[PDB]
Amino acid sequence: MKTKLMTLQDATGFFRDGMTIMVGGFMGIGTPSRLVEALLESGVRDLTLIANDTAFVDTGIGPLIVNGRVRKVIASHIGTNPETGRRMISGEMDVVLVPQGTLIEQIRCGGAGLGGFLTPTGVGTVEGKQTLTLDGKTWLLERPLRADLALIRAHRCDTLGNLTYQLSARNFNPLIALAADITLVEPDELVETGELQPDHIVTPGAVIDHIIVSQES
Amino acid sequence: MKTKLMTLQDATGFFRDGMTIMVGGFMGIGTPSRLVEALLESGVRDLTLIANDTAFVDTGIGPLIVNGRVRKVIASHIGTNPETGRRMISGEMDVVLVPQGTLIEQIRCGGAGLGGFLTPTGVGTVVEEGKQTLTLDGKTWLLERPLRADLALIRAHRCDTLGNLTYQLSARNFNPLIALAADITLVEPDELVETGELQPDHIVTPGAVIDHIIVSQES
Ligand SMILES: [Mg+2]
Ligand SMILES: [Mg+2]
Ligand SMILES: [Mg+2]
Ligand SMILES: [Mg+2]
Numbered sequence: 001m002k003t004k005l006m007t008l009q010d011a012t013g014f015f016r017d018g019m020t021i022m023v024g025g026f027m028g029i030g031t032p033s034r035l036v037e038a039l040l041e042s043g044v045r046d047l048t049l050i051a052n053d054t055a056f057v058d059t060g061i062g063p064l065i066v067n068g069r070v071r072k073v074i075a076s077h078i079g080t081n082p083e084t085g086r087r088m089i090s091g092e093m094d095v096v097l098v099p100q101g102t103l104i105e106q107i108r109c110g111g112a113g114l115g116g117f118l119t120p121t122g123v124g125t126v127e128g129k130q131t132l133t134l135d136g137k138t139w140l141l142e143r144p145l146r147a148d149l150a151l152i153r154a155h156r157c158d159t160l161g162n163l164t165y166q167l168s169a170r171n172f173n174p175l176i177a178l179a180a181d182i183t184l185v186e187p188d189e190l191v192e193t194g195e196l197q198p199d200h201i202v203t204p205g206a207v208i209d210h211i212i213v214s215q216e217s
Numbered sequence: 218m219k220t221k222l223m224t225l226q227d228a229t230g231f232f233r234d235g236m237t238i239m240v241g242g243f244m245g246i247g248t249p250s251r252l253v254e255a256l257l258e259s260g261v262r263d264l265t266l267i268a269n270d271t272a273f274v275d276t277g278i279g280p281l282i283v284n285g286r287v288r289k290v291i292a293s294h295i296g297t298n299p300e301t302g303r304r305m306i307s308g309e310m311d312v313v314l315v316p317q318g319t320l321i322e323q324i325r326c327g328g329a330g331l332g333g334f335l336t337p338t339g340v341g342t343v344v345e346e347g348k349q350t351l352t353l354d355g356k357t358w359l360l361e362r363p364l365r366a367d368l369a370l371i372r373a374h375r376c377d378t379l380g381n382l383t384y385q386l387s388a389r390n391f392n393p394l395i396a397l398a399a400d401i402t403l404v405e406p407d408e409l410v411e412t413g414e415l416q417p418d419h420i421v422t423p424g425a426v427i428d429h430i431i432v433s434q435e436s
Contacts, residue, residue, distance in 0.1 A: 115337065119331055198386045
């Protein structure tokens with residue numbers, strides 16, 4: 001048997017306190033909002049969330065933060081969500097701010113199964129990381145980032161999990177699909193295998209574990 | 218400089234002795250055939266070629282090798298081309314066999330401006346020879362450096378007049394990868410179309426990294 005097919009109700013079973021979860025979406029755009037809602041309703045806490053940003057208090061992973069479900073955020077920008085900053089300053093939540101280009105490479109590094117990469121980026125800046133001197137230059141050594149789970153939004157998805165995306169909504173989605181131990185997809189459209197043009201598939205079904213089969217109606 | 222459009226004859230003007238060239242293709246598939254023919258006809262030599270493999274004696278970059286135009290090959294497989302091995306043994310050609318995943322990441326780093334990366338691939342084996350390892354979190358990793366080239370010869374499926382490209386899955390392989398890691402990029406498209414004709418969601422290689430496009434069709 002072992003189907004990848006499942007419902008939002010089944011999604012609940014994949015959530016547990018303290019897990020690390022990667023979530024797609026750029027400023028809420030391309031965020032698997034239904035999976036995020038299921039995560040919120042599950043009631044799990046002490047989560048570590050990895051995402052491009054914390055969007056707004058009501059979008060992206062904003063609701064999870066506002067409702068106290070998150071212990072740590074790793075993202076590239078939190079300026080548009082005052083609740084993220086507030087919990088950061090109140091000591092209620094740990095926030096690790098990472099430059100976007102570097103955050104993207106760390107997640108890519110984790111999905112590639114590598115041990116780290118050398119960036120010229122951040123040198124002489126704010127430290128805690130080690131430097132490597134190679135040839136004539138100095139480099140900052142950044143480590144890979146992986147997660148227990150990834151919540152992905154896709155445009156089209158076939159029953160095997162091959163995914164395509166719309167430009168704006170793409171962002172972190174294909175990246176995190178490779179860097180999490182278990183991957184859950186919320187597709188705009190679910191179709192039979194063979195229906196997607198192979199030349200345009202972005203994310204291989206091989207890395208997709210579960211697919212939400214319902215439509216928001 | 219107000220145009221990326223050119224002919225195969227114009228391609229000859231980019232080939233110089235001793236340059237490093239990245240070439241697309243998987244076992245000969247997805248290789249920009251005509252650009253490689255031009256390269257061979259140009260008679261240039263002492264070249265360093267970077268590709269997934271050395272194909273067969275009569276396909277991909279194989280002819281460039283049999284005709285002594287290559288001093289060094291950096292690839293992940295050379296077994297289907299006996300001439301590569303022969304020249305490696307005789308000392309006629311330098312050959313650096315790189316694990317495929319590693320070769321891919323080296324080229325990706327070259328295109329991304331990174332200084333290198335740590336990989337578990339090859340640690341504790343002959344692949345370590347001549348490189349440094351580094352131990353982090355109790356694990357030992359091999360330090361690999363980025364790869365770039367002077368030129369990249371790319372085969373694309375569809376290409377618009379600005380250089381935006383799409384590929385057929387079966388011929389894609391290294392093409393989009395090398396497009397980002399070379400100083401100058403030349404594309405041999407199956408179909409050249411007007412800008413606006415390609416669906417933006419389907420563009421894989423942005424025209425910004427593409428310098429010249431072959432306009433003629435067929436072999
Ligand atoms: Mg595509
Ligand atoms: Mg997996
Ligand atoms: Mg071979
Ligand atoms: Mg360029």
